[PDB]
Amino acid sequence: TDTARLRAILAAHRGREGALLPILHDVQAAFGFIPEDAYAPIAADLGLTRAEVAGVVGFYHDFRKAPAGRHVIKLCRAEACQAMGMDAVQARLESALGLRLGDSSEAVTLEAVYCLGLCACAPAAMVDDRLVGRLDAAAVAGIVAELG
Amino acid sequence: SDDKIIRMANQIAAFFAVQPGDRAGPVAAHISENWSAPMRAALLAHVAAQSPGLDPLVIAAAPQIRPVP
Amino acid sequence: PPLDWTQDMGTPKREGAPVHLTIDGVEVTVPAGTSVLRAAAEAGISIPKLCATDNVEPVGSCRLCMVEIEGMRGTPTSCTTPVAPGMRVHTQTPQLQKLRRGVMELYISDHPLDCLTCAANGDCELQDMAGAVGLREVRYQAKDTHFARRDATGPNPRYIPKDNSNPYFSYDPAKCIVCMRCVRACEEVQGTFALTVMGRGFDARISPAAPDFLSSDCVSCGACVQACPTATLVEKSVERIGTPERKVVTTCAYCGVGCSFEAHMLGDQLVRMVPWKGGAANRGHSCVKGRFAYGYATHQDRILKPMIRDKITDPWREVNWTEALDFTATRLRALRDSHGADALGVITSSRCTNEETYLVQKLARAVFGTNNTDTCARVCHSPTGYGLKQTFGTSAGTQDFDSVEETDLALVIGANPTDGHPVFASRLRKRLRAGAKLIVVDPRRIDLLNTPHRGEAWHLQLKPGTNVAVMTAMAHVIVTEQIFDKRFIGDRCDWDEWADYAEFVANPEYAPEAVESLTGVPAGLLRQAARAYAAAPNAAIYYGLGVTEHSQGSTTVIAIANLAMMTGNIGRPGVGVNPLRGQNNVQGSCDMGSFPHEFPGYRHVSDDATRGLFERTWGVTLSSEPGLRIPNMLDAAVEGRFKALYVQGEDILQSDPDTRHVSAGLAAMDLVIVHDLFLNETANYAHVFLPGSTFLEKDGTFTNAERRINRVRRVMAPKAGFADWEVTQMLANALGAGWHYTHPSEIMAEIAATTPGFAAVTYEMLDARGSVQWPCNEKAPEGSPIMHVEGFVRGKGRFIRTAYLPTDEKTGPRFPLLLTTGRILSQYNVGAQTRRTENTVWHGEDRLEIHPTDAETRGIRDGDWVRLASRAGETTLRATVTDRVSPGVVYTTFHHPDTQANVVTTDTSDWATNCPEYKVTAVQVAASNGPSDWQQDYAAQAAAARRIE
Ligand SMILES: Nc1nc2c(c(=O)[nH]1)N[C@H]1C(S)=C(S)[C@@H](COP(=O)(O)OP(=O)(O)OC[C@H]3O[C@@H](n4cnc5c(=O)[nH]c(N)nc54)[C@H](O)[C@@H]3O)O[C@H]1N2
Ligand SMILES: Nc1nc2c(c(=O)[nH]1)N[C@H]1C(S)=C(S)[C@@H](COP(=O)(O)OP(=O)(O)OC[C@H]3O[C@@H](n4cnc5c(=O)[nH]c(N)nc54)[C@H](O)[C@@H]3O)O[C@H]1N2
Ligand code: SF4
Ligand code: SF4
Ligand code: SF4
Ligand code: SF4
Ligand code: FES
Ligand code: FES
Ligand SMILES: [Mo+6]
Ligand SMILES: [S]
């Protein structure tokens, strides 16, 4: 039921102007990544070539090339969040899970996002569509508690 | 069992038929300008011998074909 | 001469008003759009550049063409800086020196120092632009690099291993400077978007979406390999051999587009062939065949010595020239005295030059004393020269290929330019991506329809054979409505005939609503297409073998010309009725006789005023009767009264219809000479054999599809020791003529003096101007890029009443399906030149593009062996289920002789020029294991007859 979903998605975005990006968003949202078995149909329905459909997928970071773990943990690494000790939070958390920055697994996936808008709340994280701020060395406990 | 020459003649006739004005003159002129001695001779022999499977337009145009030496 | 040829200017040339600017103390005048870099180039002041080329639009990647301009803050790039009046620019200030040094430093920090052991040494644009700026040190101790195979602590994750999948070029990314002149070229020039930049930033690497180039959507055109400065994408012939020293301008021996190449030569050893940026046929672009496939000239199978047999059943005999010619001439004179001069004949070759063609038609007319000559034109594009002769007066094209740059619509009947004429398809796509519209009347989905970034497009997927019904319907639509141009008709054409034509076409029986039953195309779509074609300001028709090669080809061509005349798409750039000629010098061959009804110049043979001039110039008595045509030749030989034949540069067996009949007619032939490079299918029935010369060893000209006369130069030396014209004059003098030609210049002078149009043609002209359209007399000295610009040639166009006649190749119970025969990009017609190259990768076996629904019932699957039970023979082939073709339609290819495809083809042909019916044949496709009863026998004969002793 992959071709079906993909065809439905493409039908949903038929006639738009520059509809590649939205189509790719929807694809990623459906499966979890942009499968190489879905570079061709998109290109065909949009009149592009596999090459461009691959280049677009490569340029952008939000488009996964392979799936992530059951959970995901994005952790800002920008100036503000760095200021109020993001490094410490990072260390504590990666020791808790045992996965360094960028190092993924089947359980989780620790990565950087470089901003969330929570600059005032300097230490900021995104755990499974849930934003968290003021991440002290204690909040990490609950971060991992609800996150097996 | 169609002779290639008869076939070509009938084809040319079928074409030149739908045209306006003199329809046989052009046919004869074409057959004269394109075909060779033995072929023209064979076609004239056909039209003189009254072989069946031939367009009457060709039968009418034959006399006007370039003479064979 | 122009600088665009010798020098690589920075950016593409623009049209606009004169703008004056001062480049580093040098006054310059260039169009407004033109960039600073290109103007500086035109001024002689060179500014360092690595990522900017003329072929593609400029990008600000290198940052090496920075120049200080008065009134502009900072150091802006010349490539992306349009000129302005009175602008004073400074090319080389100290600051700019420093900055360019820094940028080259950053480059080379990530580049291997494999100079002195790399393929592109002396032909690399990174090395000269690194020496130009004056880099003397690199201060960046790099740890992160793409080339280093082994990094600290182990393998480099960035390192990408070389790719040698494609037999013609290799991709070593270790040396890539990301500039994207490969991407830009593949996307802008060729039009097949097979290359992209995978990654973001330093991690960015050029790549096709596939493991290797071969598995991708790459057609091997080498426009990336031509535009890659840093040996990343490099020809293998430059790896095996050293970098070439000299250059020589020649042309391709394919496709009739006449892509002008420059062969890069190292001594006498051909290293590579790269376009010249000259010739309006190709502005620095090419395809697989011309670019790479030139290794047939250096093949071991090539025959280099004459061979005489005396009996097909007997083996060959390697022999010198003298006694070969003696035997030949003896047999010829015997047969001549016995059966007459009309018992002889020649078959000229388009593949050869026009000089050789002239010599051959002379040999057939002056020496032999007959009018029995012919050529490949007779199976392809002969109806064209009848239709456009009956309508306009010229049996030739109407526009060049630059005209397409100004078109606004493209109507393609029976063509597949993506395969047939790739370099035309490129410049077509260049326009299609720029808004222009497209109508395709082919029954088979062509790749031109599925081009990327396409504008609007209509596809009339009809049934093969019904090509005139559709045109008639278009006409009925345009006439019932009122969209046509009355001013055009009244000025350039006749009205009294137009009235009859309209009253005929206006009949409601030739309407789109009634033809849908027999044609298979919808009515609404057809009406829409017609309205679109009629409405557009500058439309253009391009037609090929889907109209000509049928039972009604001349009729269809006439209908097409009627359309083009009615609508008013004639006598202007962007509009015309262009036939897409095939082989090189088909136009030149047809112009230099090569027909049994004319003399050089499309003059009839019965013309006394012409025969007089020719008898006067040749000092010999000629005949006034038109000669036999190949079908006639063979039918005669079967019946008798035809004994001799001198086949030049042609394969009358594999490349002709009803293989059985043609073989039977070629067998009953006391003498059949062969004059090809290789031992061919036709030479299996030969008694004599004379080696030939390739376009590399030749010297002369080629007359392509757009009437352009390109010049062919000698780069190698003849391996047989003699060119084709030399062999022809050998034979002619050995028979008794008495010619003395030491150079084709004299021959061309003769041609000029004899026929008009070439009256002003001289090799000096061809060198200086470069190329000429053959209608070049004292009037129109420069040439005639466009025909019928001021009134037609006959004086007034003619509207002819075309009609649809049911073809005799209709389908029935035991022959339900239909058949078609076409081509591929990689391989050429018979592949006697191309199968002997590395182009057997893309196509090494001919296949059958059957439809899925027409496969399930029979039990066919992709990769299965099937038999084509036709009426005129039988054959076996490997199947391919595809939704490309329509149901009840089939498509085969004739490139490979292992599969005898033309044994299925029937003897049915056109009415005027007798051009065979290659594109329609009622077949039956079934499943089978045993190949055939014909293929077996053919193989046996070819094996027992190609033995030398
Ligand atoms: N089923 C089917 N059959 C077809 C067609 C089709 O569409 N479908 N198309 C028809 C048409 S369009 C044509 S053009 C023919 C084309 O096909 P042919 O008429 O067969 O011409 P070529 O493919 O060049 O090869 C013929 C021989 O001439 C040799 N030759 C090549 N260059 C030279 C040269 O410079 N000098 C000399 N002395 N010899 C040379 C070649 O090596 C080869 O041995 O095929 C025809 N047959
Ligand atoms: N790489 C490469 N280049 C070549 C050649 C080659 O073999 N290989 N061949 C050379 C030669 S000598 C030739 S003649 C030229 C010309 O070459 P083209 O003019 O491109 O002709 P083809 O590719 O044979 O087929 C024409 C297209 O129209 C379709 N068609 C079939 N029947 C009909 C019909 O009834 N009506 C209509 N409207 N369309 C139909 C055919 O199926 C096919 O897709 O190209 C030259 N260039
Ligand atoms: S591509 Fe040019 S600069 Fe790089 S190693 Fe080869 S010759 Fe040297
Ligand atoms: S060879 Fe031609 S088609 Fe292939 S990648 Fe290079 S430019 Fe593109
Ligand atoms: S492959 Fe060649 S042309 Fe393409 S980005 Fe690399 S250096 Fe430039
Ligand atoms: S085959 Fe045609 S397009 Fe290709 S290089 Fe030769 S002339 Fe040019
Ligand atoms: S900077 Fe990390 S919150 Fe905006
Ligand atoms: S040099 Fe003009 S930007 Fe590359
Ligand atoms: Mo051809
Ligand atoms: S041709």
Short mmCIF file of N, CA and C and ligand atoms in Angstrom, two decimals, chain C residues 111-112 114-115 118 120-121 124 126-127 175 230-231, ligand 3:
data_model
loop_
_atom_site.label_atom_id
_atom_site.label_comp_id
_atom_site.label_asym_id
_atom_site.label_seq_id
_atom_site.Cartn_x
_atom_site.Cartn_y
_atom_site.Cartn_z
N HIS C 111 42.48 19.80 -3.50
CA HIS C 111 42.77 19.18 -4.79
C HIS C 111 44.07 18.38 -4.73
N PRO C 112 44.08 17.20 -5.37
CA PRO C 112 45.31 16.40 -5.39
C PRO C 112 46.36 16.99 -6.31
N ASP C 114 48.20 15.75 -8.47
CA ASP C 114 48.47 14.67 -9.41
C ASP C 114 48.83 15.24 -10.77
N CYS C 115 48.98 16.56 -10.84
CA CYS C 115 49.51 17.19 -12.03
C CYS C 115 50.79 16.46 -12.38
N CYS C 118 48.39 13.24 -14.53
CA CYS C 118 46.94 13.26 -14.73
C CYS C 118 46.63 13.36 -16.22
N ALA C 120 44.38 15.22 -17.88
CA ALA C 120 44.19 16.56 -18.42
C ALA C 120 45.33 17.48 -18.06
N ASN C 121 46.54 17.12 -18.47
CA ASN C 121 47.69 17.98 -18.25
C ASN C 121 47.92 18.79 -19.52
N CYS C 124 43.77 21.42 -18.82
CA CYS C 124 43.01 21.65 -17.60
C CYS C 124 42.87 23.14 -17.34
N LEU C 126 41.86 24.44 -14.49
CA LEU C 126 42.17 24.77 -13.10
C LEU C 126 43.65 25.04 -12.98
N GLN C 127 44.44 24.37 -13.81
CA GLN C 127 45.89 24.45 -13.71
C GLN C 127 46.39 25.77 -14.27
N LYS C 175 38.89 14.92 -7.84
CA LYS C 175 39.45 16.13 -8.43
C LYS C 175 38.38 17.15 -8.78
N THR C 230 38.55 20.10 -14.95
CA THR C 230 39.54 19.49 -14.08
C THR C 230 39.60 17.97 -14.11
N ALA C 231 39.49 17.39 -15.29
CA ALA C 231 39.79 15.97 -15.48
C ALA C 231 38.95 15.04 -14.63
S1 SF4 D 3 42.68 18.01 -13.24
FE1 SF4 D 3 44.21 19.58 -13.86
S2 SF4 D 3 44.95 20.46 -11.90
FE2 SF4 D 3 43.86 18.53 -11.37
S3 SF4 D 3 45.52 16.96 -11.30
FE3 SF4 D 3 44.67 16.91 -13.41
S4 SF4 D 3 45.98 18.34 -14.60
FE4 SF4 D 3 46.38 18.77 -12.40
#
